[PDB]
Amino acid sequence: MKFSLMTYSMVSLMRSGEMNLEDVIAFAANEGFDAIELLMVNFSRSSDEIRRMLETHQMKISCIDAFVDLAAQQEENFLENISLSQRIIDQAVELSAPMVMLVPGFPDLIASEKDKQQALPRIISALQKITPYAQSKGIVLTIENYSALQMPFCSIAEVLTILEQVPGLRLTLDYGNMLVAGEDPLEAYEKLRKYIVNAHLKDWKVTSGQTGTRCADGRHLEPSLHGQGVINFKSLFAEMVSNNYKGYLSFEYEGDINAKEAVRLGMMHLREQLNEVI
């Protein structure tokens, strides 16, 4: 039951220039994380440089995350996105990360029911091409269940449909995203357990006005510090220990509290809950 810190959780401070990637790695080390989950949106940093930072701070990468448009209808773009996915797998090899997580589409690019219906077999086809490459390189490929419901990979049923058609594909369960999709997060873990090799932990609190995140049941949702919202982390941890889960628990925070403070506060809660289970 090791914890990893998503670099995406620190994106506010990376965007302001207050933290660079090495600062995020050093902060993860200082806060007792076993790994980082590295969001990769370009290859501008050399592998040598990242490896140096990891060695300096005695840190590992548990998983590399990327957004890739595997729903692309244009053949040349679709093919280049499969190629980009293979480049990401190569980066995992170079950086000793055991796993990749792809978000295989973009919500603004699905603008109708027909678009969603067409995106699904396209995404499946792409993953059927990418996963064998990942396997040949010794890398575990996952997708994440998402929060924008026009994407055909949010509900338990949607993610199961993909996983059952892509040999060897695994799942990063974003526990909080399941709430947005109208699912019970614990039931999602139970139904998808055999596929779950990685997990994202984030929390939500209910609001009165629009947020750009409304779950299927109508409740307005705002990112919450972990333990201050509605997600029951202890029940998940109890089931995971019961089932001898061996993956990482990745800290995700998408809110507006200072990112370092949010990590310190939320990890206090998550560690307390895990200790109650252990």
CB of 142 to a copy of itself, least distance (A): 18
CA 15 to chain centre: 19
Contacts of a copy of itself in 50-79 (CB under 8 A): 67, 73-74, 76-77
Decide which of a copy of itself, Mn ion, none touches 244; Cβ closer than 5 to 8 Å per partner kind.
none
Q: Which residues on neighbouring strands pair with residue 143, listed in sequence order?
A: 102, 171
Q: Measured from the CB atom, is 55 or 113 closer to a copy of itself? A: 113
Number of residues that bind a copy of itself (CB under 8 A): 48
Residue 102 forms beta bridges with which residues?
A: 66, 143
Nearest to 163 by CA among 186, 140, 184, 185: 140
> Which listed range, 13-21, 173-181, 193-201, 243-251, lies at the site for a copy of itself (CB under 8 A)?
13-21
Neighbours of 28 (CB within 10 A): 26
Query: Judged by CB under 8 A, which stretch of 55-63, 125-133, 160-168, 205-213 contacts a copy of itself?
Result: 205-213
* 50, 51, 54, 57 alpha-carbon torsion, rounded to 10°: -100
251 in Cβ contact with 225 (< 8 Å): no
Convert 140-149 to b/e letters by CB count within 10 Å (16 or more is b): bbbbbbbbbb
Residues between 161 and 200 that touch a copy of itself (CB under 8 A): none
- Asked whether position 277 contacts a copy of itself by CB under 8 A, the answer is no
From the CB of 146, what's the least distance to Mn ion, in Å? Answer: 8
> For residues 219-258, which are near a copy of itself according to CB under 8 A?
222-223, 255-256
